Design a protein around this ligand. Structure first.
Ligand SMILES: NC(=O)c1ccc(S(=O)(=O)N(Cc2ccccc2)[C@H]2CNC[C@@H]2N(Cc2ccccc2)S(=O)(=O)c2ccc(C(N)=O)cc2)cc1
Ligand SMILES: [Cl-]
Ligand SMILES: [Cl-]
Ligand SMILES: [Cl-]
Lengths: 99, 99
Protein backbone atom coordinates (compact mmCIF):
# COMPACT_ATOMS: atom_id res chain seq x y z
CA UNK A 1 0.00 0.00 0.00
CA UNK A 2 0.55 3.72 0.04
CA UNK A 3 0.10 5.01 3.58
CA UNK A 4 -0.39 8.69 4.22
CA UNK A 5 0.56 10.23 7.51
CA UNK A 6 -2.42 12.31 8.57
CA UNK A 7 -3.02 9.67 11.18
CA UNK A 8 -0.56 7.34 12.84
CA UNK A 9 0.46 4.57 10.45
CA UNK A 10 -0.94 1.82 12.64
CA UNK A 11 -1.16 -1.50 10.94
CA UNK A 12 -1.92 -5.06 11.90
CA UNK A 13 0.98 -7.43 12.41
CA UNK A 14 0.97 -11.13 13.16
CA UNK A 15 3.50 -12.69 15.46
CA UNK A 16 3.40 -15.91 17.40
CA UNK A 17 0.04 -16.54 15.78
CA UNK A 18 -1.45 -13.38 17.23
CA UNK A 19 -2.69 -10.19 15.61
CA UNK A 20 -1.42 -6.99 17.10
CA UNK A 21 -1.53 -3.32 16.16
CA UNK A 22 1.82 -1.75 15.50
CA UNK A 23 3.18 1.58 14.37
CA UNK A 24 5.29 1.86 11.24
CA UNK A 25 8.11 3.99 12.57
CA UNK A 26 10.84 5.13 10.22
CA UNK A 27 12.64 6.84 13.12
CA UNK A 28 13.05 3.49 14.89
CA UNK A 29 16.05 1.55 13.71
CA UNK A 30 14.61 -1.56 15.23
CA UNK A 31 11.36 -3.33 15.84
CA UNK A 32 10.21 -3.22 19.45
CA UNK A 33 7.08 -4.90 20.71
CA UNK A 34 5.33 -4.87 24.03
CA UNK A 35 6.09 -7.60 26.49
CA UNK A 36 5.25 -10.94 24.96
CA UNK A 37 6.49 -14.50 24.77
CA UNK A 38 8.90 -15.31 21.95
CA UNK A 39 10.75 -18.52 21.30
CA UNK A 40 14.39 -19.17 21.80
CA UNK A 41 17.16 -17.31 23.47
CA UNK A 42 17.44 -13.56 23.67
CA UNK A 43 20.37 -11.24 23.95
CA UNK A 44 20.62 -7.82 25.53
CA UNK A 45 20.17 -4.67 23.54
CA UNK A 46 20.22 -0.99 24.37
CA UNK A 47 17.87 1.26 22.47
CA UNK A 48 18.09 5.03 22.57
CA UNK A 49 14.78 6.75 22.76
CA UNK A 50 13.67 10.20 23.34
CA UNK A 51 14.22 10.02 27.10
CA UNK A 52 17.39 7.96 27.09
CA UNK A 53 18.57 4.40 26.60
CA UNK A 54 16.88 1.33 27.97
CA UNK A 55 17.55 -2.38 28.03
CA UNK A 56 15.32 -4.58 25.93
CA UNK A 57 15.32 -8.25 24.94
CA UNK A 58 16.55 -9.11 21.47
CA UNK A 59 15.16 -12.15 19.73
CA UNK A 60 16.57 -12.98 16.34
CA UNK A 61 15.08 -14.65 13.31
CA UNK A 62 11.49 -14.29 14.40
CA UNK A 63 8.65 -14.76 11.96
CA UNK A 64 6.45 -11.71 11.78
CA UNK A 65 3.89 -10.60 9.24
CA UNK A 66 3.31 -6.90 8.63
CA UNK A 67 0.13 -6.06 6.82
CA UNK A 68 0.26 -9.52 5.35
CA UNK A 69 3.86 -9.21 4.23
CA UNK A 70 5.98 -12.00 5.65
CA UNK A 71 9.22 -11.05 7.41
CA UNK A 72 11.76 -12.91 9.54
CA UNK A 73 14.15 -10.88 11.55
CA UNK A 74 15.07 -9.31 14.85
CA UNK A 75 12.34 -8.36 17.26
CA UNK A 76 13.02 -6.52 20.46
CA UNK A 77 10.70 -6.84 23.42
CA UNK A 78 10.44 -4.20 26.10
CA UNK A 79 8.44 -1.32 27.51
CA UNK A 80 7.77 0.51 24.33
CA UNK A 81 5.01 3.11 24.18
CA UNK A 82 3.46 1.15 21.33
CA UNK A 83 4.42 -1.84 19.23
CA UNK A 84 6.83 -0.50 16.66
CA UNK A 85 7.94 -1.81 13.30
CA UNK A 86 11.24 -0.09 12.66
CA UNK A 87 13.56 0.05 9.74
CA UNK A 88 14.98 -3.46 10.04
CA UNK A 89 11.64 -4.93 9.08
CA UNK A 90 10.34 -2.00 7.03
CA UNK A 91 13.34 -2.56 4.77
CA UNK A 92 12.53 -6.25 4.56
CA UNK A 93 9.03 -5.64 3.35
CA UNK A 94 10.25 -3.12 0.81
CA UNK A 95 8.93 -0.02 2.48
CA UNK A 96 10.16 3.39 1.41
CA UNK A 97 9.33 6.99 2.11
CA UNK A 98 8.19 8.90 -0.96
CA UNK A 99 7.41 12.53 -1.68
CA UNK B 1 12.37 11.39 -3.86
CA UNK B 2 12.12 7.79 -2.85
CA UNK B 3 13.96 7.25 0.36
CA UNK B 4 15.28 3.83 1.31
CA UNK B 5 15.18 2.59 4.90
CA UNK B 6 18.44 0.68 4.83
CA UNK B 7 19.81 3.70 6.63
CA UNK B 8 18.17 6.32 8.76
CA UNK B 9 16.20 8.68 6.47
CA UNK B 10 18.17 11.76 7.31
CA UNK B 11 17.55 14.93 5.38
CA UNK B 12 18.69 18.50 5.47
CA UNK B 13 16.18 21.03 6.61
CA UNK B 14 16.26 24.79 6.81
CA UNK B 15 14.52 26.38 9.77
CA UNK B 16 14.96 29.77 11.38
CA UNK B 17 17.75 30.46 8.91
CA UNK B 18 19.64 27.39 10.12
CA UNK B 19 20.54 24.29 8.14
CA UNK B 20 20.03 21.14 10.19
CA UNK B 21 19.94 17.39 9.73
CA UNK B 22 16.75 15.70 10.71
CA UNK B 23 15.20 12.25 10.65
CA UNK B 24 12.00 11.62 8.66
CA UNK B 25 10.08 9.93 11.39
CA UNK B 26 6.67 8.45 10.79
CA UNK B 27 6.43 7.33 14.42
CA UNK B 28 6.60 10.91 15.63
CA UNK B 29 3.30 12.77 15.72
CA UNK B 30 5.09 16.09 15.73
CA UNK B 31 8.42 17.49 14.70
CA UNK B 32 10.99 17.82 17.48
CA UNK B 33 14.24 19.73 17.20
CA UNK B 34 17.22 20.31 19.45
CA UNK B 35 17.34 23.57 21.35
CA UNK B 36 17.11 26.60 19.11
CA UNK B 37 15.40 29.93 19.02
CA UNK B 38 12.14 30.32 17.15
CA UNK B 39 9.89 33.31 16.66
CA UNK B 40 6.50 33.76 18.24
CA UNK B 41 4.54 32.35 21.12
CA UNK B 42 5.15 28.94 22.54
CA UNK B 43 3.69 26.74 25.19
CA UNK B 44 5.28 23.90 27.12
CA UNK B 45 4.63 20.29 26.37
CA UNK B 46 5.97 16.92 27.46
CA UNK B 47 6.66 14.23 24.93
CA UNK B 48 8.01 10.82 25.58
CA UNK B 49 8.67 7.33 24.47
CA UNK B 50 11.39 4.86 25.32
CA UNK B 51 13.47 6.18 28.16
CA UNK B 52 10.90 8.64 29.34
CA UNK B 53 9.69 12.15 28.78
CA UNK B 54 11.23 15.45 28.03
CA UNK B 55 9.87 18.95 28.23
CA UNK B 56 9.72 20.89 25.01
CA UNK B 57 8.48 24.24 23.80
CA UNK B 58 5.73 24.07 21.27
CA UNK B 59 5.85 26.69 18.54
CA UNK B 60 3.09 26.69 15.95
CA UNK B 61 2.98 27.97 12.36
CA UNK B 62 6.74 27.66 11.80
CA UNK B 63 8.17 27.53 8.30
CA UNK B 64 10.54 24.65 7.62
CA UNK B 65 12.07 23.71 4.33
CA UNK B 66 12.56 19.96 3.95
CA UNK B 67 14.36 18.90 0.81
CA UNK B 68 13.35 22.11 -0.94
CA UNK B 69 9.79 21.55 0.10
CA UNK B 70 8.27 24.33 2.15
CA UNK B 71 6.00 23.34 4.91
CA UNK B 72 4.34 25.10 7.79
CA UNK B 73 3.57 23.49 11.11
CA UNK B 74 4.31 22.94 14.77
CA UNK B 75 7.86 22.52 15.89
CA UNK B 76 8.67 21.19 19.31
CA UNK B 77 12.01 22.37 20.66
CA UNK B 78 13.84 20.67 23.50
CA UNK B 79 16.54 18.27 24.53
CA UNK B 80 15.85 15.61 21.97
CA UNK B 81 18.82 13.39 21.12
CA UNK B 82 17.92 13.61 17.47
CA UNK B 83 16.20 16.14 15.23
CA UNK B 84 12.92 14.68 14.10
CA UNK B 85 10.52 15.59 11.29
CA UNK B 86 7.22 14.18 12.42
CA UNK B 87 3.99 13.44 10.65
CA UNK B 88 2.68 16.96 11.18
CA UNK B 89 5.18 18.18 8.57
CA UNK B 90 5.66 14.97 6.59
CA UNK B 91 2.06 15.28 5.50
CA UNK B 92 2.69 18.76 4.20
CA UNK B 93 5.37 17.64 1.83
CA UNK B 94 3.21 14.76 0.63
CA UNK B 95 5.32 12.08 2.21
CA UNK B 96 3.96 8.59 2.22
CA UNK B 97 5.02 5.11 3.24
CA UNK B 98 5.02 2.66 0.33
CA UNK B 99 5.40 -1.09 0.05
N1 LIG C 1 4.17 13.15 20.79
C1 LIG C 1 5.07 13.39 19.81
O1 LIG C 1 4.80 14.21 18.94
C2 LIG C 1 6.35 12.69 19.83
C3 LIG C 1 6.64 11.69 20.80
C4 LIG C 1 7.88 11.03 20.74
C5 LIG C 1 8.91 11.42 19.82
S1 LIG C 1 10.43 10.59 19.91
O2 LIG C 1 11.52 11.59 19.90
O3 LIG C 1 10.44 9.60 21.01
N2 LIG C 1 10.67 9.71 18.49
C6 LIG C 1 11.73 10.26 17.59
C7 LIG C 1 13.06 9.55 17.84
C8 LIG C 1 13.59 9.56 19.18
C9 LIG C 1 14.81 8.83 19.31
C10 LIG C 1 15.55 8.22 18.26
C11 LIG C 1 15.01 8.20 16.92
C12 LIG C 1 13.74 8.86 16.79
C13 LIG C 1 9.83 8.49 18.36
C14 LIG C 1 9.33 8.27 16.92
N3 LIG C 1 10.32 7.36 16.26
C15 LIG C 1 11.13 6.66 17.25
C16 LIG C 1 10.84 7.30 18.65
N4 LIG C 1 10.21 6.26 19.50
C17 LIG C 1 8.95 5.54 19.23
C18 LIG C 1 7.68 6.24 19.63
C19 LIG C 1 7.66 7.10 20.75
C20 LIG C 1 6.43 7.70 21.04
C21 LIG C 1 5.27 7.42 20.30
C22 LIG C 1 5.29 6.55 19.18
C23 LIG C 1 6.55 6.00 18.83
S2 LIG C 1 11.11 5.76 20.85
O4 LIG C 1 10.20 5.04 21.70
O5 LIG C 1 12.01 6.81 21.30
C24 LIG C 1 12.10 4.54 20.04
C25 LIG C 1 13.43 4.92 19.73
C26 LIG C 1 14.28 4.00 19.06
C27 LIG C 1 13.77 2.72 18.76
C28 LIG C 1 14.63 1.73 18.01
N5 LIG C 1 15.95 1.72 18.18
O6 LIG C 1 14.04 0.98 17.25
C29 LIG C 1 12.45 2.33 19.05
C30 LIG C 1 11.63 3.25 19.75
C31 LIG C 1 8.61 12.42 18.85
C32 LIG C 1 7.36 13.08 18.87
CL1 LIG D 1 19.96 -7.83 30.25
CL1 LIG E 1 16.40 -7.93 11.20
CL1 LIG F 1 1.17 21.23 12.81
Amino acid sequence: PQITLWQRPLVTIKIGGQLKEALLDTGADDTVLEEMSLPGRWKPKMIGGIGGFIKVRQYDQILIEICGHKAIGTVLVGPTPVNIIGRNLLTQIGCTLNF
